[PDB]
Amino acid sequence: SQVFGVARIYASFNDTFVHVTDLSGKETIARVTGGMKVKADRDESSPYAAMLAAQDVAAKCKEVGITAVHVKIRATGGTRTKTPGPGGQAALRALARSGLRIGRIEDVTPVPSDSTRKKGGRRGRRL
Amino acid sequence: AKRTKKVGITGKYGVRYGSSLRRQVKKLEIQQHARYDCSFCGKKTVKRGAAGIWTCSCCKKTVAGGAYTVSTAAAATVRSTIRRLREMVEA
């Protein structure tokens, strides 16, 4: 009821991304989430780190000012596990709690019509 | 009786130049010598000479074509896409 934008959340495995932008698409945000406050190189996806960096995300969001925004979350997907990452939900929650208004949501995880064969061969990763 | 098991028309070259070179030649050789079917009269009377020139014995027409076959794969595919791009400029 006050203002709108875009969330653009993305949670990979061993990294995660979050960045707002105008609902017109090209626009901008500040966008630095993944290995920004956490630098151990394996805690990149970690939820304790997703919030630590998502915090500074809402900061700039409100620094220039956006009260409400809807989400568009996306997993690495495409051709590798089509599923949310650890720091995906652990970030917008720390931000919805940051005094942010949300609403209509849907994910944009890319899924194909069974093509572009994956890595690892027919025997896959062996361990 | 069958005269040659494999050489066919390439037997003129005898034993020289290697089986591979001779074999591949026979391929284009067969094509450039055979009689094709004429598109303007319906009779198979169009033969080559002066590669890229295919003329019908009767009806006297001369068609430009591949060096060894009347229609080359590329030209045939072009005919298709030219029809496509053309059907696209009246309707």
């Binding site: - | 591949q24 590669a51 001369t62 068609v63 430009a64 074509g65 005919r79 791009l85 400029v89």
Partner: protein, 202 residues
Amino acid sequence: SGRGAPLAKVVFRDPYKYRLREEIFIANEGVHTGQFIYAGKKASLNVGNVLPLGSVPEGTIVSNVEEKPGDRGALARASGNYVIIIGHNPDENKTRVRLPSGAKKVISSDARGVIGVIAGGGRVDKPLLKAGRAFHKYRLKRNSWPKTRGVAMNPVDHPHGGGNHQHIGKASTISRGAVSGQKAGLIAARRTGLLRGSQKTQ
């Protein structure tokens, strides 16, 4: 004689005099005797006709394309060669196309081309099989055959000349800035060795 692709003699009326003028075109694959050819901007898109690159849509196939509007044919003239129109910039009225070499040059839309591909394609697929056929081939082009390997000559005859064994003796790649007399071998070669890979520019 001396050309792989066949020629096409096309007769036209002289719009300024009661007289016939006979142009000599390169026969595109499919053209036939007694065919009707159309030439101009407001012409149809039929294989054989000649239209400016602007008047044709993307993906068209043309040969004997003009580098500049009105040079009577400069590109895609060898047996079975063609160029493809891959775009138009109606402002500056340019038209970007792909040549047989793969290079993508942009030229004026008023430049002309003939719909289709050149005839006599696939001539190079048949081996020559004997020096005689190569001999007769060049008997009509020029005195460029046969070729003596510079490594079989004495030093007085070539850089690669001389030696108690047949060898080049120094790098076969030669600088572009080289001088006439030393530019023999791989000139300005940016690479060398057997090409193993994609072999098609993106």
